[PDB]
Design a protein around this ligand. Structure first.
Ligand SMILES: COc1cc(OC)c([C@H]2C=C(Nc3ccc(S(N)(=O)=O)cc3)C(=O)O2)cc1OC
Ligand SMILES: [Zn+2]
Length: 258
């Protein structure tokens, strides 16, 4: 009876095995655009992905992860709210059964069709497992997806999903350029929060881009053909793998822009 997104093991159950689910800095949150304060002391954001080394794509039963070589500073996030250097280790998405839901963060309670998370760890803790034990251990760059025009930089991901349909399947995924997933603008919102899946650790500086990317209905339909289940188990479509908005509590969301 491990955690997931069903009625019997979904986000309302997680607190039973992971009590930090009801903690003070849980993610995601609703971003109230009229309450978020422009902070003129936020430095520009530095996304330096030109030397990024992608290796593998994995269906982990909750999402699919595109994994990077993080054994050196190759693909890093710096600046904005961050001190020091955060190494890209993986990206993944959360998405819905229909275009009206799927994002984890919301903007004035608006839900996007999906949300991309680019996950980075703070190099001053040496490895990822050490970083997630620290309040400033991770930086996740969150990017909303809306359904419209195709994202060309996403199609190599979409076309490999048939090969990793079920939990525990992986495929070689070299020479993938994550810069193809970014919007034009790096304007963002930032707040301190958590992992959005168990173990829900309160180790994340969230950086959520204001500008969504557009993907096509055909691209997101292929996300929805993935399976949560292992091969030769009953088919459960991988849809609605998003946690809903958590209480903001004693936190302030900061805007990079006026
Ligand atoms: C208790 O120790 C661990 C358990 C554990 O899973 C049960 C894990 C898992 C969780 C991991 N990471 C992760 C989860 C959510 C996000 S999101 N959606 O962007 O907020 C980003 C990263 C990971 O790599 O692995 C990591 C752990 O330690 C490193
Ligand atoms: Zn995520």
């Amino acid at each position: 009876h491990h955690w997931g997104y069903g009625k019997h093991n979904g986000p309302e159950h997680w607190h039973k095995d992971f009590p930090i689910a009801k903690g003070e800095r849980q993610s995601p949150v609703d971003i109230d655009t009229h309450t978020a304060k422009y902070d003129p002391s936020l430095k520009p954001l530095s996304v330096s992905y030109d030397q990024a080394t992608s290796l593998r794509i994995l269906n982990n039963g909750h999402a699919f992860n595109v994994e990077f070589d993080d054994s050196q500073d190759k693909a890093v996030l710096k600046g904005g709210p961050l001190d020091g250097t955060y190494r890209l280790i993986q990206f993944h998405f959360h998405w819905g059964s229909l275009d009206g839901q799927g994002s984890e963060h919301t903007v004035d309670k608006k839900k996007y069709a999906a949300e991309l998370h680019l996950v980075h760890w703070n190099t001053k803790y040496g490895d990822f497992g050490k970083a997630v034990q620290q309040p400033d251990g991770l930086a996740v760059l969150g990017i909303f997806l809306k359904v419209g025009s195709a994202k060309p930089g996403l199609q190599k991901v979409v076309d490999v999903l048939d090969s990793i349909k079920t939990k525990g399947k992986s495929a070689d995924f070299t020479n993938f350029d994550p810069r193809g997933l970014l919007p034009e603008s790096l304007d963002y919102w930032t707040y301190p929060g958590s992992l959005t899946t168990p173990p829900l650790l309160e180790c994340v500086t969230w950086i959520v881009l204001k500008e969504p990317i557009s993907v096509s209905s055909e691209q997101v339909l292929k996300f929805r053909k993935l399976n949560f289940n292992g091969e030769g188990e009953p088919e459960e479509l991988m849809v609605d793998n998003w946690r809903p908005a958590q209480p903001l509590k004693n936190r302030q969301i900061k805007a990079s822009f006026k």
